[PDB]
């Protein structure tokens, strides 16, 4: 169900984002942003090094990850 | 456990 | 706020009211029906001074069949 | 279902919109379209000739059209000829300037229903979300505008549409005709936002004075850079492809808001036809 | 100041003429009088207050009522239906979310039916020729956007209050064009607050001078002077709120030239 | 009401009801009133979340008695090269902010009465970690996502502050086995909760043994993503007589069946074992122990200020009054 | 039971039976510089408040207190002073809220004109106070 976005190679950083199937999107923290132990808990399965860096208010259901290059 | 740290090519 | 939930005037008979509204609702086709030679009530084209063709949706653009929201 | 299309008596077609809900009455879209398409009459606009109000259904006759820049948008493998794109935007920008000087907004300008005739004339046909700006109009969430055609002011959650929402959506996005591929094909609002920064620079407080207060303005934004002019290779250096407003100028009050798109070295060619298919 | 503004003003000054109600219905339909019309208007005012309907929609609904009534006789007791229908049609043109018909028949003390409201909405649209974009007073107030001073506030509230007051009193305001009463309301609030006169820019923007607005200006002054004295009022109950900066509290100068 | 003799208490009372922007404009006198405004009784709970901070703007506000400074997700990178005085802030929150290291040092080198810090996802430096050892009253330190400090700075920080109740030293990359060993062999014996998670190839059984022997009063222990726990470390947790919310999530070497062994512990209440319990066996494991809440409470409440499903704006049970709305 | 305390050489007419307990100064008592015309108002308000008797942020005022709000600015200034002198809690809360509400929005210009603050004149420091408070834009 979940979708994994492609990498938007920036300077000194590499990004991506993931949209939830709305059965997990209600299980998302709105005050704090999660860590590699809590978004791996929801069901997101990516490589090692992806960190949540910002939560987009108009779309709470989309998770944004960045990673040093 | 089979190298889970892999983006799922679905 | 029941001060807005009021009945300004004395109640008026509804049968003549709805009969009169239906009179205009049916008389609103005096000129339009004959002008276009189109039976808008039954969605049928009259054999008058207007050409009509039932073309498939694929041919004409999608603005002419865009499903109302 | 089937649509009945008429021709020249000496050409129009029926848009049959049904009313079978009886919950709010006639749809809000219909009242907002019929009322504004009677006082809006330009040679570069589709004309609403007549309307018939049946008790159960509501009709509307429209000037018949075909070219939708399906046909003449993607069905050009070798490409839509450049003289066409020198004229298919001149008339449409004329219509946009007229309507903005006529107290009417068009908002979503999907090239999907941007109907054009064989002779070469360009007319706007989209007026569902067309709230007139005589008095200020607040923003809407459920009012659907296609992701690929939303301004950075609207993506960042501003409150007033004002003008220059319609100036760029089709008066500056003709890259779906000169490149045959959407300039910013986003997948969501954040992804589209980043796609804009990729090829359009980054919203600092120098390009866009006051960008910081933007409701969606988060300082974590990926810091990219301008892509010069490699985005549109076919057109020549016509004032830098009119870089004064090319794509998006991040200042909506400097996005050729005052002057029209006609007082430029561009737009001095002839109107070629396209009667094929 | 955008570059298209003057053309918008010119088009509005051409388009309110075709959309001006006539004075015939005040003495051609003996079933109703201007008093009922005003009571229905006040009804609409609270109603707009209840559902937070925009004042622009109130102006548009009043204009629809005036233009509809001047071309067909309406019986007593059915003016409730046309008032409700006009409010509903006005909301469905400017308000982002139109209230459902059930709430608008609820407001009528549940004395009508949904189908009756819909049938009246059909007829009202039919007679008016489907021309609902009506230039009104508030549209002309905002047409002169803060041309007194760049940071001139607390004066627009009083002018908007004057504009709303002009709606209830049919006479002698049906004769005046919306632009004239708009200018007079824009002038009287300035005279009350800062004591200045008609701003110079509007003199060459509209073409109206301080002598052309005098017949209307008197009428607006007279209406303001008795505004608390006038009974059957609810528009004054809205502008006494701190949102309107209490324009109703301030007394008229009563010394207007 | 205005006078040259109006009571200061009365006008302070009228001020107390004013909002933050109104208070900014409460300086009507442009003179005397100006002073009575910057009184410390007014600025006591500053909810300056988001927004932005100019040079020496957060410093000036912190100077006049602010104790709860909620400033998460903010942009305060502009250098503050101006003399200040020791701030009395006691409950800071700079979670996921974008502060620069230099100005972070400049500000944090003055707060000495702190007892609630949250520097999640921020880049620190040695001087900044050392200067956090000058305020020993810390009972809650959140440090997840941080980086940039050597082992000596961590040793000094964790040896000087001997009162920490809750530490969240999790997912701090640029960590070697030496960092984990120093963090476990020097953490205060008074801690009741810890979150040494995310260290796959640095956590060995010896470190767990040191932790369980040294610290006997743990109530929560989250060793998430620990690939070196095997099947012989359950007797290590059996030595914990107060553990209640052990979360051995994603420990691949752990055999599923022997999770039944963890049911013998009486104090155990919940057990998040996400990632290693296969389908079907999870239901049987839940049925076997009805007293355990297997596979619940996804997120961590360990030293996180704003925990809650509903949108909350109180940091560790403290609600601010002065807010930016 | 029915105590009518001394006034500023005026008329002693009050009950103070569970009524003056709201006034902390009266509580310590069981006058020096009172004023009688609001003092009767203080008595009636205190009676009604005792009838009402059976981070926090709220600003609402009961209908009785909006009706009894002294319209005259000098009357309100005297009422606030009497409330401070008598150490009334509830009525002090009401008058503080009323002064804040009148202060709400408006303008310092209008604020110093409706008040007796004629000391607005400063050594061009208004520019300083405009620059310092420029970190919050609306």
Numbering used by the authors:
A (entry chain F): 3005 to 3073
B (entry chain G): 4181 to 4190
C (entry chain C): 25 to 93
D (entry chain A): 16 to 25, 29 to 87, 89 to 296
E (entry chain B): 175 to 431
F (entry chain E): 2095 to 2419
G (entry chain D): 1002 to 1031, 1041 to 1064, 1079 to 1162
What does the paper say about this structure?
p27KIP1 (cyclin-dependent kinase inhibitor 1B, p27) is a member of the CIP/KIP family of CDK (cyclin dependent kinase) regulators that inhibit cell cycle CDKs. p27 phosphorylation by CDK1/2, signals its recruitment to the SCFSKP2 (S-phase kinase associated protein 1 (SKP1)-cullin-SKP2) E3 ubiquitin ligase complex for proteasomal degradation. In contrast, low p27 levels are commonly identified in cancer and associated with poor prognosis. p27 is degraded via the ubiquitin proteasome system, where phosphorylation at Thr187 by CDK1/2 signals its recruitment to the S-phase kinase associated protein 1 (SKP1)-cullin-SKP2 E3 ubiquitin ligase complex SCFSKP2. Notably, p27 bound to a CDK-cyclin module is the SCFSKP2 substrate and unusually the binding site for phosphorylated p27 is contributed by both SKP2 and the accessory protein, CKS126,35–38. Using cryo-EM, we provide an in-depth structural analysis of the quaternary architecture of the CDK2-cyclin A-CKS1-SKP1-SKP2-p27 complex which forms part of the SCFSKP2 E3 ligase that controls p27 ubiquitin-mediated degradation.
Here we report an experimentally determined structure of the isolated CDK2-cyclin A-CKS1-p27-SKP1-SKP2 complex using cryogenic electron microscopy (cryo-EM). SKP1, SKP2 and p27 were expressed as full-length proteins but their structures could not be fully modelled. In the case of p27, the kinase inhibitory domain (KID, residues 25–93) and C-terminal sequence surrounding the phosphorylated Thr187 residue (residues 181–190) were modelled but the linking residues (94–180) were not visible. In the closed conformation the average distance between cyclin A and SKP1 is ~ 8 Å, whilst in the open conformation the average distance is ~ 16 Å.
